[PDB]
Amino acid sequence: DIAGLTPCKDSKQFAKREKQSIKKLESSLKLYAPDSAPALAINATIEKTKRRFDNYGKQGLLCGADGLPHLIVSGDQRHWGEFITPGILFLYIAGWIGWVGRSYLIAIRDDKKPTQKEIIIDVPLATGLVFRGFSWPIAAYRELLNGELVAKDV
Amino acid sequence: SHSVKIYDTCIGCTQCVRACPTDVLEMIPWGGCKAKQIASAPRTEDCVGCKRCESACPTDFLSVRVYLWHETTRSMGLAY
Amino acid sequence: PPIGPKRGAKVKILRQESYWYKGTGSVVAVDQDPNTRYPVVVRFNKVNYANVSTNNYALDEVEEVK
Amino acid sequence: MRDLKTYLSVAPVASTLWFAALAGLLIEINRFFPDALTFPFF
Amino acid sequence: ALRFPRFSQGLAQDPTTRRIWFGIATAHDFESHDDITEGRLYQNIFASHFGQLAIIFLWTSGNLFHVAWQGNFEAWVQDPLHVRPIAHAIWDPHFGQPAVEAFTRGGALGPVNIAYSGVYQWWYTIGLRTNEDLYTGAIFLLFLSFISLLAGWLHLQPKWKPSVSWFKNAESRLNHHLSGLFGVSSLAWAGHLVHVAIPGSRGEYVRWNNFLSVLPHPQGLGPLFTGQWNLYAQNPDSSNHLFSTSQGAGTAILTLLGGFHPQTQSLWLTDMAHHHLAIAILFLIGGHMYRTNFGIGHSIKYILEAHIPPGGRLGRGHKGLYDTINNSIHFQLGLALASLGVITSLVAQHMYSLPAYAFIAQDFTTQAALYTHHQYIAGFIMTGAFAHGAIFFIRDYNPEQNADNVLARMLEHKEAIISHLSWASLFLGFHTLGLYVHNDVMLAFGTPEKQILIEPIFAQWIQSAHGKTSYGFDVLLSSTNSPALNAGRSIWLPGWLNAINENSNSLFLTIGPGDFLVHHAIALGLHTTTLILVKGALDARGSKLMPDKKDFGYSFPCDGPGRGGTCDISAWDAFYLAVFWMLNTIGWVTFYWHWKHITLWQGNVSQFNESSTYLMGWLRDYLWLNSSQLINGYNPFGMNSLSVWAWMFLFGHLVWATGFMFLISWRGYWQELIETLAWAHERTPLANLIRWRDKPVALSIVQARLVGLVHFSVGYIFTYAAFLIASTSGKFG
Amino acid sequence: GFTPPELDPNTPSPIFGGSTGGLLRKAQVEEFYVITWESPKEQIFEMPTGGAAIMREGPNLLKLARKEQCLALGTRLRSKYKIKYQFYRVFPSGEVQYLHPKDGVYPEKVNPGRQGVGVNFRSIGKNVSPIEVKFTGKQPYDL
Amino acid sequence: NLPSLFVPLVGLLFPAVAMASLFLHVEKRL
Ligand code: CLA
Ligand code: CLA
Ligand code: CLA
Ligand code: CLA
Ligand code: CLA
Ligand SMILES: CC1=C(/C=C/C(C)=C/C=C/C(C)=C/C=C/C=C(C)/C=C/C=C(C)/C=C/C2=C(C)CCCC2(C)C)C(C)(C)CCC1
Ligand code: SF4
Ligand code: SF4
Ligand code: SF4
């Protein structure tokens, strides 16, 4: 496929890793009784291993010669779930955190002792501001156009 | 010996002279500030360079300045 | 006549070696006695590196900003 | 009572409660959706 | 004056031992010495340059002498791939009999060291064939070192010392350096290649006795004055050609094949001769740019004055930069060190990928040693470039003469530059470390499939853009339709495409996710080392903490415990902190290079591609595994020739750890300890008849940082050099 | 006008058994210092060099190796106890040099007979850049 | 044979003369 890689559903090394991993867990399983609690734990880990390998091969992950999923972050639309889509999700969360904390610092900057509300959190004020990050890309963008995001001459 | 200088931003609080451990600073009369007194460094031959005077200056920026210069027996703090 | 700015007005500190250089503070007292090279007394919101919140400046060292 | 609530709002206690709730949430997310190197829902 | 040092009275009047140390550490700082002038400054610099040139010529002269005396050069020419070259002979009376036995190798009579600098391949490729040739070159360089000292002494007496105006003649100096020093030298080197090296590479021994009789080309010179230069490229050597012989030899002297000589695996000697000739004549024409005594040329001042963008986004542009640099020797040295460090790393990256010396690509120990050497050299040079940039800002920068130009504007927004350098270092550091730890935890829990292995697809796309097929991105040179491919098929592309897709050499090696992670660690190292040096250079004249730092100089201990504490606040301390990051960065660079090649030379590139993605693989499959033969250089059962590295290996561990003492423990503890020792000596009988003439004191705070850094760096370099060579030469592959 | 008291030898010294922090060859060939004070009674005081000594009643003379040792002991004599003190410097020739209190007034108290030394009449940030004093024996603060 | 003469001449005699002469110059007074 891309960069000489082969999809994990086609790679033999990928399937050999799944085999050897499951057979290694089965080798640990023979030591215990079929009704034992370690047996149900190892069986659950085996089922969890099958689920993991199957999910990786199903969602179009590319594999190298090592049989391990390689990620393609160039922006190719076949693999946006590998970086761009989770990255946009992160930037939404990160902007939320920064915008809410910024709203908090602005609200307490006019207090008599602003340091008091920085080492002892005003939870009521925080709880009222935590949901402004939901619309942070909008409130930030408007503050960009209105000259409210950046302090003048610093 | 180390060089010590007093700038006219001094307010005359006499704190550099109290912190000095080798009696290098003095308080002379002056007409620039309210306390009618400024600092001077007439005995920098005994100055060790501890900058304990700069740690006590309330002026921003400092009015005492200790410029570490040529080391001597007195400036190195040697008892031998 | 009162030399310097009125008391309480915001002042932009222009002394380059000051902890509050290019920042802003508030006036306390303007010493009308001449021969005083630094009459303007300014109090600041944040302490400097010596935990000092007030300093004296010259007239050409402060600018009145609203 | 008000003093007790003011203590619970101090930085370490608020951090522990906030990070404990955060740790538990991420643990349950990786419990119902383990592994996952990608965003599979497209 | 009155005593040592005669150039500093304040040091001479020091009653303590500090007089000696600071007298040595400040011998070359001409600007700080008593009664220095601009004339004496430039003149001492001029003579120091001549002394350095004499040092370099004498050093190369000695290298030739030992290779010709105790070496293997004559025997090595016959078997380039089966003879271990000899550096010199070993005569250590501490050797046991087995040490003499194990160190006798390379086909010598006594114990010898195997040379790993590559001068054998270098000298064989340029035409040197016998030990007599090396003796001739050594005498010439010994004589050249003599005339270097002669000229250095000559320009120190009156009427030979030049005025500072002569040193400030920048236009004339650039014209001659570009024309003569750069171009004429490259032109004459192309002459040596087409007269002695190329015919020497075809069986014809051309020397000073017979160079006037032989023709470098059958139809020599004629076509050069006609325009039919292509006749010099008609008959190259066959791809089945032996270097020291004539089977497959041709008659061309200037070609553009593009690949390697198949036998020697080095660049085509005709390509190198044509290369030097082309860049030479390009330097020759370029050396006529600036104005001298003939009414034509440019004024570098006026060019800098004219480059000002309207709208004022750069303010007053480059106005005043001419005198700013022409009056500051620290500015000039900063630019020189910056450019030299860049091209030094350029040499490192090109000598391993494009070997130009015959039979040097198979000497794997030599390739690893050369690349490591130049990369650490370049790392130090880069730290020095930024160090002297800060020294310029303190000692030479005039703010009024640089008013509102680009230089002063750098200071005007110093916080923006430093903060963003900090953000980039934080971003790179957070994520690169995080990904490495994630993969480490995955492989700990036995789930390799959960690693985050990002494909370095942008550099892979560039390698495909150069014609590499391993990734199949079908771009130019890798796609049959692109005009970049069609325009070059006639010339360099056959040999170039033949070499890039050969799986033996290191011309654009295959890269994977492991290479992606290491390159981001490299970006972290470059960004953070740049951050340290730039923050120190911009905050060298002043900071919010110390607004008058320029008055205290470049190197001072601190400003006291007041205002919160001001330890390591000078720009010298910024340099001192950046050298640790430089060593760490070059360490990452060289760990990367050596592991990829030592797995390539072993034919096991899969171990690197699978283990370089997690740091436990670097500790286990690189350092621990390759240290086997090294640490067994001497064991309770005997020793072999690798013992000299096992010893130096531990030697480097000692010096390095000794530097921690100077860097962790600080002065006041040792001063009080020395006081208790001075009392002990004065009160001890017999010994009190001996009196010290310099008072014992503890090392200065700045001296301690320097001594600790030097121990750290020496241990760093020696530990890695010992491991590098022992792990590579122990296998030789 | 002030007249410094001359150093009177044969003045009693505090009771002390001896310590290793005393004088060395520096006192023999270079210089040493001597602090004097009055004191009301016999007391114990910590020595700036070693342990404890018994301050004699009436005039006291104590020879030290450094000037800082004298001022440190004097400051404690002025704080813990209420004792005035002077100290001098002694060269190997026998010459004595009066040091502190110089004017007879303590240096932290303004006295009209004092002259300015090293007093620059400008803001500290008004010093010049080092290039403007290059190739001269000057510093931007000496002026 | 030449190493048996020059190796001690630079590792023993040369540092001996160099360290002694530098000691005399450094400790010299005017
Ligand atoms: C910088 C070049 C250089 C270097 C690094 C070395 C290094 C070495 N030489 Mg060598 N040598 C050199 C140049 C050099 N040499 C030159 C130009 C000659 C004359 C052709 C010799 C002749 C020579 C002989 C005969 C022998 C060595 C030997 C040795 C080895 C033992 C050390 C020794 O005896 O000191 C070097 C002794 C010398 C006499 C060389 C010094 C004379 C030249 C002109 C240098 C000028 C020295 C000058 C006074 C100070 C230089 C300033 C500074 C750069 C050091 C050692 C590895 C010995 C050996 O083989 O060990 C087994 C030995 O037998 N050398
Ligand atoms: C770098 C130059 C250098 C050279 C050429 C030598 C050479 C030698 N070392 Mg030495 N060493 C050196 C550096 C050097 N060392 C350094 C830097 C250290 C510190 C780590 C040491 C520490 C060291 C130790 C601990 C010992 C040696 C010993 C020896 C001798 C062992 C071989 C032997 O058995 O001979 C012959 C053995 C003899 C006893 C004959 C002695 C040779 C005659 C007496 C020399 C005459 C000296 C001359 C009159 C004056 C010399 C100084 C003068 C130039 C001012 C040998 C001659 C061993 C030794 O000396 O044996 C006791 C030994 O114990 N070395
Ligand atoms: C409201 C909190 C907040 C915000 C909005 C920012 C914003 C910013 N920081 Mg920053 N920082 C913070 C807290 C914050 N910081 C804290 C607490 C520290 C100490 C660890 C730092 C240390 C720091 C450094 C060293 C640097 C920045 C830098 C920057 C700038 C570049 C983005 C970045 O690198 O962020 C990265 C964020 C971090 C490295 C740590 C953030 C920790 C959390 C996520 C933020 C705190 C949230 C707060 C506790 C929530 C309060 C809740 C309230 C409602 C009650 C950016 C404008 C960089 C810069 O200079 O710009 C060029 C830079 O070099 N920051
Ligand atoms: C052509 C390059 C070049 C030139 C001409 C200069 C020139 C100068 N430098 Mg500079 N520098 C350079 C490159 C250069 N540098 C590089 C690459 C670095 C990065 C390492 C530095 C870092 C640097 C600093 C930090 C400083 C200078 C300073 C100076 C000035 C005074 C130097 C002096 O007299 O001290 C004398 C130098 C020595 C006595 C060298 C002793 C220390 C060496 C490294 C120990 C040897 C290592 C070890 C013991 C040997 C190997 C071990 C063994 C077992 C094998 C001077 C004008 C100083 C200055 O004046 O600042 C204003 C200053 O502090 N430089
Ligand atoms: C054509 C006339 C000419 C020539 C040939 C030179 C040549 C030189 N001048 Mg000079 N100069 C000239 C005219 C000239 N000058 C005039 C007219 C003036 C008055 C304005 C000056 C004023 C002047 C000053 C003030 C100084 C010099 C200096 C130098 C020396 C520079 C240092 C050096 O050797 O680096 C060598 C440079 C090269 C070999 C070319 C560049 C090297 C490239 C970048 C890398 C190497 C290429 C290649 C890859 C190497 C392969 C490695 C392999 C061979 C091992 C050099 C030999 C310095 C000096 O005097 O030193 C004593 C110096 O201070 N000149
Ligand atoms: C501090 C300071 C200083 C110093 C500085 C420095 C040190 C700098 C640097 C820097 C550096 C170190 C840089 C580097 C660089 C480089 C560059 C800038 C480049 C480039 C190029 C390009 C762009 C390319 C292109 C191409 C080609 C040509 C072909 C192929 C393709 C490609 C694309 C690759 C001074 C003294 C001045 C002043 C004072 C201050
Ligand atoms: S540095 Fe110390 S000894 Fe010197 S004047 Fe200041 S306080 Fe006195
Ligand atoms: S500490 Fe500063 S302000 Fe106070 S008297 Fe001394 S110089 Fe003046
Ligand atoms: S003397 Fe040492 S501990 Fe004190 S401020 Fe200077 S560097 Fe820091």
Swiss-Prot record, chain B:
Pfam families: Fer4_21. Its main location: plastid. Binds 2 [4Fe-4S] clusters. Cluster 2 is most probably the spectroscopically characterized electron acceptor FA and cluster 1 is most probably FB. One of its GO terms (biological process) is photosynthetic electron transport in photosystem I. It is a peripheral membrane protein. It catalyses: reduced [plastocyanin] + hnu + oxidized [2Fe-2S]-[ferredoxin] = oxidized [plastocyanin] + reduced [2Fe-2S]-[ferredoxin]. Its EC number is 1.97.1.12. SUPFAM superfamilies: 4Fe-4S ferredoxins (SSF54862). The keyword Metal-binding applies. This is Photosystem I iron-sulfur center. The gene is psaC.
From Swiss-Prot, chain G:
Its main location: plastid. It is found in: Plastid, Chloroplast thylakoid membrane. The chain crosses the membrane at residues 6-26. GO terms for cellular component: chloroplast thylakoid membrane; photosystem I. GO terms for biological process: photosynthesis. It is a single-pass membrane protein. Keywords: Chloroplast, Membrane, Photosynthesis, Photosystem I, Plastid, Thylakoid, Transmembrane, Transmembrane helix. It comes from the Eukaryota. The keyword Thylakoid applies. May help in the organization of the PsaL subunit. Belongs to the PsaI family. This is Photosystem I reaction center subunit VIII. It comes from Pisum sativum. The lineage of its organism: Eukaryota, Viridiplantae, Streptophyta, Embryophyta, Tracheophyta. The gene is psaI.
